[PDB]
Every structure is written in structure tokens, then in C-alpha cells.
């Protein structure tokens, strides 16, 4: 409802900037997924960087599953494909190719 994405986005990166442990990361991630606002690739990269800082790969698994299935978005795929591949090959967090064939 005529709400700017930039303000809440910048709030998200600023919150992830001081990620001392996983609690604030988790709460901010839950808040971001609470809205209908589909997260941008930039905030997803920031979240993965914070998860790397706090060293919890399962949190990365959870967020990747959430991005795979959060809202229908008219069943968009290639957007999901690019938004996953850029952050997979930016630094390397191999997790998706294991839980699926198990």
C-alpha cells in the first residue's frame, strides 16, 4: 500500500550490519518474510553474509527454502533461478543439492 521499499530495505541491511549473533538475524529475516514484499537479491546476499558471519549453514538452508516457496508470485521460476544462482556462486554455500535427493 504505497510503501517505499528503500526505507525498509536499508533498515534490513543496517540491522544485518551489527549481527552479533543469530537472534537478530532470525527476527529480521522473519520480519522480512512477514510482509508480501518479496526480498531483493541484495538483501538476500546481505542475509547470507550475516549467516556466514554467525556461521550457521542450516539458516542458509531455511532461507533458500523460503525463497523457493514463500508466495505464489504467479509461479515465477527464472527470477528464483537467478536470485539463487547469483548468491550460490558469489562465494559458495553448497546446500541445495543434498537435502533434495535424500
Amino acid at each position: 500500500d504505497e510503501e517505499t521499499f528503500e526505507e525498509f530495505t536499508a533498515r534490513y541491511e543496517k540491522e544485518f550490519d551489527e549481527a552479533y549473533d543469530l537472534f537478530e538475524v532470525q527476527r529480521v529475516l522473519n520480519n522480512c518474510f512477514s510482509y508480501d514484499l518479496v526480498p531483493a537479491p541484495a538483501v538476500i546476499e546481505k542475509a547470507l553474509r550475516a549467516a556466514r558471519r554467525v556461521n550457521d549453514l542450516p539458516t542458509a538452508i531455511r532461507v533458500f527454502e523460503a525463497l523457493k516457496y514463500k508466495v505464489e508470485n504467479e509461479d515465477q521460476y527464472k527470477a528464483y533461478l537467478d536470485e539463487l544462482k547469483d548468491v550460490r556462486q558469489e562465494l559458495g554455500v553448497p546446500l541445495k543439492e543434498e537435502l533434495f535427493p535424500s
Partner: protein
């Protein structure tokens, strides 16, 4: 870039089973009195 939907495809393929199931549920909930009426000797049958 409007990938896939085209709302109509998934919209129909998802609601049609649901509306059919709900119609069947209502049909059963209205035919159980009809089942009782049929089973009872309403017409000495």
C-alpha cells in the same frame, strides 16, 4: 517478465478441483437427508 502465468492456467487448475470437491461435499450434505428419504418407506418400496 510475466514468467508462466498467465493467471488463468494455475488459477483454473487449482480452483476447479477445490470447487468440485466443495460441490461434492455440499451434495453429500444435502443427499444424506435424501438418502434417508429414499431408504425409508416413503413410497412403500
Amino acid at each position: 517478465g510475466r514468467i508462466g502465468e498467465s493467471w488463468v492456467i494455475t488459477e483454473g487448475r487449482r480452483l476447479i478441483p477445490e470447487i468440485f470437491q466443495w460441490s461434492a461435499v455440499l451434495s453429500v450434505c444435502l443427499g444424506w437427508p435424501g438418502a434417508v428419504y429414499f431408504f425409508s418407506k416413503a413410497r412403500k418400496a
